[PDB]
Every structure is written in structure tokens, then in C-alpha cells.
């Protein structure tokens, strides 16, 4: 389609289904998820969102990203910090895993930010809009399954306190995405990078699932 947002949606439909039908995620959806499992994804999200947001900050003033820069509304690093402190204790920093699939994702994010900032929007879209749209569904699953203490922390990641309405925000985001001017060369690269992002996720889930069964 003409609009980037639509083109991304449709171009990635295959990999997104593959991504949502990864075993780990399938079991997540069906309600089967363990504490160790949850601790792992949260640790992954941290590494990922640290890298992503590091590179967003690097390129926030560039024309190729500035229009989709919404720091207050989207930033996840902090909430992840809050959550990991809960899940892993005060020395979470030192004791959280950093598996090869996490490195591979972190690595790509940095190579994009440093040398292809024009593609960064692919990852921003993939992650933020994804987690926004599939958050609140995951979240509910997690609390029923993980049978948590009434300690009032652990799931901050699944709430974007500065976005009153998701639907309004998604539209505004898409609008801004589609405002981005780019050559057809770049546009296809961006579409591919989005597929890449889904794969990096897919392989990460395969990796986590492998670890959890051993």
C-alpha cells in the first residue's frame, strides 16, 4: 500500500503470525508461563529497550526519526528497571542473563542506530506499537498465571502511564510514520528491517524455550 504503516502491516503479516505462534508465545497465550520464563522475557525486553532507546536518543533530531520521537509517551527503560528490581532483587543489574539471542538483537539495534538511522523506525514500530497493542492482553494472562504477591510492582512494563488512549496514540504514531519522507530504496529497506525485527524476536523465543526445557 501507499502508506508506510499499511505497507509494514501487510508486509510483515507472515512473520508476525510466525512470531505470535512461536511456542513460547503460544504457551503464553494459552496461559502456560512460568516465573523463570517470565523473568527471562523481562530480562530480554530490558536489554532490547535499553539498546533501542539509546539509539533513539542518538538520532532524535534527525529528519529520519524526529517525527516519531515520543519519549514521554513510550520510553520503557525505566519501567523495565522497576520490574527487574522486583523480579531479580536489588542486584538485578549484575545477575540478569544476557544470552546470545539477546546480544544478536541488541547488536542489530546498535548497528542500525549507528550506521542506518533511517531504518530505526522499523524497530520502533515493531516494538512500541506491538507491545502497546498486545499489552493489556499479555499482562492479564501474566497475573492470572504467575499468581503474584500483592506487592504492587513487577508489571509496570505493560502500562504506558503517559498514553491516555492507546487507539488515539496508535493513529498519531502511524500518521507520523507516514509523514516520513523517504526514497523507494529506503522504504523497502525499512520494510525488510521490520521483517528482520520480527525474526530477531522469533529466534529469541526459540532460544528461551530451549533454555526453559533442559
**Cα–chain-centroid distance for residue 60?**
18
* Minimum CB–partner distance for residue 87 and a copy of itself (Å): 10
Considering the complex, state which of residue 9 and residue 187 has its C-beta at the smaller distance from ligand HEM: 9
Q: Long-range pairs for 14-23 at CB < 8 Å and ≥24 separation?
A: 15/195, 15/198, 15/199, 15/202, 16/198, 18/198, 18/202, 19/198, 19/201, 19/202, 19/205, 22/202, 22/205, 22/206, 22/209, 23/205, 23/206, 23/209
Binding residues for ligand HEM (CB under 6 A): 5, 9, 16, 19-20, 25, 28-29, 126, 129-130, 133-134, 137-138, 198, 201
* Minimum CB–partner distance for residue 55 and a copy of itself (Å): 18
Binding residues for a copy of itself (CB under 8 A): 75, 78-79, 81-86, 90-94, 139, 142-143, 147-156, 158-165
Q: How far apart are CA 48 and CA 43, in angstroms?
A: 9
Angle (CA) 97-100-104 rounded to 5° is 120
161 binds, among a copy of itself, ligand HEM, none (CB under 5 to 8 A by kind): a copy of itself
Angle (CA) 172-69-171 rounded to 5° is 10
* Minimum CB–partner distance for residue 22 and ligand HEM (Å): 8
* Minimum CB–partner distance for residue 81 and a copy of itself (Å): 4
Considering the complex, state which of residue 61 and residue 174 has its C-beta at the smaller distance from ligand HEM: 174
Considering the complex, state which of residue 24 and residue 157 has its C-beta at the smaller distance from a copy of itself: 157
Considering the complex, state which of residue 82 and residue 178 has its C-beta at the smaller distance from ligand HEM: 178
Q: What is the 3-state secondary structure (H, E, C) of 141-203?
A: HHHHHHCCCCCCCCCHHHCCCCCCCHHHHHHHHHHHHHHCCCCHHHHHHHHHHHHHHHHHHHH
Considering the complex, state which of residue 91 and residue 214 has its C-beta at the smaller distance from a copy of itself: 91
All three cell numbers of 6: 499499511
175 binds, among a copy of itself, ligand HEM, none (CB under 5 to 8 A by kind): none
19 binds, among a copy of itself, ligand HEM, none (CB under 5 to 8 A by kind): ligand HEM
* Minimum CB–partner distance for residue 147 and ligand HEM (Å): 19
Amino acid at each position: 500500500p501507499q502508506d508506510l504503516s499499511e505497507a509494514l502491516k501487510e508486509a510483515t503479516k507472515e512473520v508476525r503470525t510466525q512470531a505470535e505462534n512461536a511456542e513460547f508465545m503460544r504457551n503464553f497465550q494459552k496461559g502456560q508461563v512460568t516465573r523463570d520464563g517470565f523473568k527471562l522475557v523481562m530480562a530480554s525486553l530490558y536489554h532490547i529497550y535499553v539498546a533501542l532507546e539509546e539509539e533513539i536518543e542518538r538520532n532524535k533530531e534527525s529528519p529520519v526519526f524526529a517525527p516519531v520521537y515520543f519519549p514521554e509517551e513510550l520510553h520503557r527503560k525505566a519501567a523495565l528497571e522497576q520490574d527487574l528490581a522486583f523480579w531479580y532483587g536489588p542486584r538485578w543489574q549484575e545477575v540478569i542473563p544476557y544470552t546470545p539471542a539477546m546480544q544478536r538483537y541488541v547488536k542489530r539495534l546498535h548497528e542500525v542506530g549507528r550506521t542506518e538511522p533511517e531504518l530505526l523506525v522499523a524497530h520502533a514500530y515493531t516494538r512500541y506499537l506491538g507491545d502497546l497493542s498486545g499489552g493489556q492482553v499479555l499482562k492479564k494472562i501474566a497475573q492470572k498465571a504467575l499468581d503474584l504477591p500483592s506487592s504492587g510492582e513487577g508489571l509496570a512494563f505493560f502500562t504506558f502511564p503517559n498514553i491516555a488512549s492507546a487507539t488515539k496514540f496508535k493513529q498519531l504514531y502511524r500518521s507520523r510514520m507516514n509523514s516520513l519522507e523517504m526514497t523507494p530504496a529506503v522504504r523497502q529497506r525499512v520494510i525488510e528491517e521490520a521483517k528482520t525485527a520480527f525474526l530477531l524476536n522469533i529466534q529469541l523465543f526459540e532460544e528461551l524455550q530451549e533454555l526453559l526445557t533442559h
